[PDB]
Paper text:
We collected datasets for the dark on-state using two different methods at the SACLA/EH4 station using the DAPHNIS chamber. For comparison, we obtained complementary data using the droplet-on-demand method for the dark on-state, using smaller crystals than those used for the grease method, which were delivered in the crystallization mother liquor. The hit-rate could be carefully controlled with the crystal density, and levels of 40% could be sustained with crystal densities of 4.8 × 107–9 × 107 crystal/mL. Table 1 shows the CC* and R-split values that reveal data from the droplet method was lower quality than that obtained from the grease injection method. The comparison between the two on-state structures collected with the grease injection and droplet methods under the same conditions (Black) showed the lowest R-factor over the intermediate resolution range up to ≈3 Å resolution. An increase of the R-factor for the increased resolution (<3 Å) is likely indicative of genuine structural differences between the grease and droplet methods, in agreement with the observed degradation of R-split and CC* when merging intensities together (Black). The R-factor for the on- and off-state experiments using the droplet methods (green) (but at different photon energy) is considerably higher than the two off-state measurements conducted at different facilities, including the lower resolution reflections. Following complete refinement of all four datasets, both on-state structures showed no statistically significant density in either the 2Fobs-Fcalc or the Fobs-Fcalc maps that could be assigned to a trans chromophore structure. The same was observed for chromophore omit maps, that also, at lower sigma levels, did not show such density. This is in agreement with the dark incubation and dark sample injection which corresponds to a 100% on-state concentration. Photoisomerisation is clearly seen in a comparison of the “on” and “off” refined structures where the dihedral angle of the chain connecting the phenol ring to the rest of the chromophore (N–C=C–C) changes from 1° (cis) → 171.1° (trans) in the on- vs the off-state and the pheonolic oxygen is displaced by 6.2 Å.
Author numbering: 2 to 61, 65 to 220
Write the structure that this text describes.
Amino acid sequence: SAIKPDMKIKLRMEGNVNGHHFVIDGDGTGKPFEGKQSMDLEVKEGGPLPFAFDILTTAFNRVFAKYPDNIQDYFKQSFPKGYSWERSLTFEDGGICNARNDITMEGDTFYNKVRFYGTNFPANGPVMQKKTLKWEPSTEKMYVRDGVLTGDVEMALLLEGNAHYRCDFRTTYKAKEKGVKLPGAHFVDHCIEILSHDKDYNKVKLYEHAVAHSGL
């Protein structure tokens, strides 16, 4: 009821990957109940980025996920006050990232304050050499670990040369308001796509479709 069927999205990301500093702005719309969102991104500082845009893209809100009536929707119940998440990304060649987002809502707009820090990417690796093509579609497993709603996902970045480059996501999610009830364990299928880009990925349009389910 706080959440409307059509919502706007405003975003700023600040960050640092292998010592390279950057600022990216986002402006988007989505449909919370249909699990669908898209966003226009614009690098404001630090471009052209010297690393694969793709590592960033899952950091640019689990409110945009279609929940059936039989799974508690922790994210939609967190509003208007909102919620935050923190995520670790562990890549198979030793690259590591920590991201966080603090999400708030004013009227019909979600505001997102995002931080992204990456380190230990090898200079000869697919991320620093810009050899990535896309994330494969994924299934996040949602469960409770020590009172905290936790999502794990085994992700795969398709590289040039038909190889995959693997990484493990762990995200913890916390409602701002005390006493929003935790859900039971469940799944969310995701698909994320770059729809269009310019030469150095200074402008990117992004799309995500997500659906919650009980595994059947």
